Design a binder for this molecule. Structure first.
Ligand SMILES: CCCCCCCC/C=C\CCCCCCCC(=O)O[C@@H](COC(=O)CCCCCCCCCCCCCCC)COP(=O)([O-])OCC[N+](C)(C)C
Ligand SMILES: CCCCCCCC/C=C\CCCCCCCC(=O)O[C@@H](COC(=O)CCCCCCCCCCCCCCC)COP(=O)([O-])OCC[N+](C)(C)C
Ligand SMILES: CCCCC[C@H](O)/C=C/[C@H]1[C@H](O)CC(=O)[C@@H]1C/C=C\CCCC(=O)O
Ligand SMILES: CCCCC[C@H](O)/C=C/[C@H]1[C@H](O)CC(=O)[C@@H]1C/C=C\CCCC(=O)O
Lengths: 272, 272
């Protein structure tokens, strides 16, 4: 019972709150560019997901059974839905930003003059409503949310329960595929411009390349074990699945740092 | 066995490295003496984490300390815990006296403060803490294996004298730090009320800085020092939580002094 400890949810709630609050504080001070707008609501998305989820886990620990706390399973269905909504939201808000950076450097002339904040609100609103619509399936009969080991959290049941558990996994793999494909394309598109002009111009490219590669590293470390393990169960088992959902939750903790806060700490054929 | 988990030392080693490395990076970029003392404080905390955590991880992954250490490593482990624990406690206490004497006489402090004094205070604390930790090797005290067999520390039951000398030294370091900060806060608000948004903005920001130092130290170090005193004059479980809370102070050090300011950066009577 090494993983059964309230020290993890309490630590994850405090670090997630502080990181996401500092991010929302800086964006309110600076503006409202669209990149600042998308990061501000991404930090707000991750924080709400942590406040709606973690306090329930702490109560179950300090009380010592989910069944006697939740008769009829009213709270468990809400818990599993909130896990699915905010999990997919972070995955696809990041995928949207990957397409933004790809189309920005591909055409800085048209992007710097035709990008509007009304498009940013449309993409943020579309991801929210689409992810909520998918999480409503177990309430509508397609899928089921059940209590997971060790009785302190609810998630998608893995054994049309197997179809719904498979639709979530491929959606996550899709979000990582779009994010990794656009970032690698942006890195190559950025280095080619640096090699055509050839310390200011080359310094920005390497700093931006580290930014894109770091995003891929966090996502692949945090989300891969959970998505892969779900696929293995559809087609120690209780123990490793708890570590995986905690690693997936870590991605929403590291989000404000990989996008905004680390840049601020390090901020501040000679022009070359 | 909720506290017996390698997830804590691994997590604490990575967060401690990142925080202290970013601190050392910023001070090198900017050798004032306040920047110098923070730079070597972050270097102290990192070395203490690098000398201690890798041993704990091996004991976890191997599944007994005795068969691994036929007690040469255990004595070195307890000494390193004592050296770097006291160093952080009294380097912070030294800085508290620096801020007290700086605002008390900004005229003499801004003209007579030299970097050779900063190196003398940093060197004195290091050698004094090493001298105290050498006592168990010299016969006064003892380092023993602690529950659950993954770390060594001062035995608590002249073993009782040496265990009591460590606890009172910690209470002394918190007393000096809390006394100087409260005096500095009062001296700063009184100067702000004599001139009466720029001048009042600096005072409140510095007051939050001083109060935050007191909150971290009292939360991280109080349970360990008090619990040792209770045992000299669940017992295995709470003592592990206490030494992990004391270690948390060295993780939060680079943020409470340097990194949080960087993220948030930028009757005499806009100057007020
Ligand atoms: C900014 C960057 C900071 C990153 C640092 C993160 C490193 C944190 C790494 C780990 C930190 C080490 C904490 C040691 C606690 C161990 C407790 C234990 O063993 O399990 C017991 C838990 O029962 C409890 O008592 C829960 C106590 C929760 C306190 C955890 C620290 C909270 C601060 C969070 C950190 C500060 C957040 C705010 C910082 C501004 C037994 O549980 P059970 O009964 O079996 O159920
Ligand atoms: C600025 C940063 C602020 C954010 C701070 C994040 C706070 C993170 C708070 C807590 C995060 C917890 C993550 C889930 C881990 C669960 C593992 C578990 O349950 O115990 C198992 C451990 O056995 C293992 O498998 C070890 C795995 C180590 C992963 C721990 C995270 C390491 C990264 C570091 C994470 C920080 C990232 C570092 C770089 C930023 C059981 O062990 P056993 O009983 O011995 O068998
Ligand atoms: C699929 C994952 C999406 C979740 C997104 C959300 O932002 C994360 C919430 C986490 C947060 O890190 C703290 C916490 O405990 C929440 C629940 C995560 C795992 C439950 C483990 C229960 C236990 O500790 O026993
Ligand atoms: C007296 C305190 C001085 C220690 C200062 C040093 O900076 C802290 C080192 C910590 C670090 O946070 C990770 C770690 O495990 C080191 C040892 C701390 C507790 C041992 C518990 C062993 C276990 O987990 O089982």
């Amino acid at each position: 019972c090494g993983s059964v400890s309230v020290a993890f949810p309490i630590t994850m709630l405090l670090t997630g709150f502080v990181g996401n609050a500092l991010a929302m504080l800086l964006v309110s001070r600076s503006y409202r560019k669209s990149f600042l707008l998308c990061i501000g609501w991404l930090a707000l998305t991750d924080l709400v997901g942590q406040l709606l989820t973690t306090p329930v886990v702490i109560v179950v620990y300090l009380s010592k059974r989910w069944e006697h706390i939740d008769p009829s399973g009213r709270l468990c269905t809400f818990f599993g839905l909130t896990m699915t909504v905010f999990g997919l939201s972070s995955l696809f808000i990041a995928s949207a930003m990957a397409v933004e950076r790809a189309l920005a450097i591909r055409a800085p002339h048209w992007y710097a003059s035709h990008m509007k904040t009304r498009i940013t609100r449309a993409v943020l609103l579309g991801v929210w409503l689409a992810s909520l619509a998918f999480a409503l399936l177990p309430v509508l009969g397609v899928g089921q949310y059940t209590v997971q080991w060790p009785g302190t959290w609810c998630f998608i049941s893995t054994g049309g329960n197997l179809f719904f558990a498979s639709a979530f996994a491929f959606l996550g793999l899709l979000a990582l595929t779009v994010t990794f494909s656009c970032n690698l394309a942006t890195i190559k598109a950025l280095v080619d411009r640096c090699r055509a002009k050839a310390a200011q111009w080359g310094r920005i490219t390497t700093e931006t390349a580290i930014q894109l590669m770091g995003i891929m590293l966090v996502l692949s470390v945090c989300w891969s074990p959970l998505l892969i393990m779900m696929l293995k169960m559809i087609f120690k088992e209780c123990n490793f699945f708890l570590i995986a959902v905690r690693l997936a939750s870590l991605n929403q903790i590291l989000d404000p740092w990989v996008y905004l806060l680390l840049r601020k700490i390090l901020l501040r054929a000679k022009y070359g």
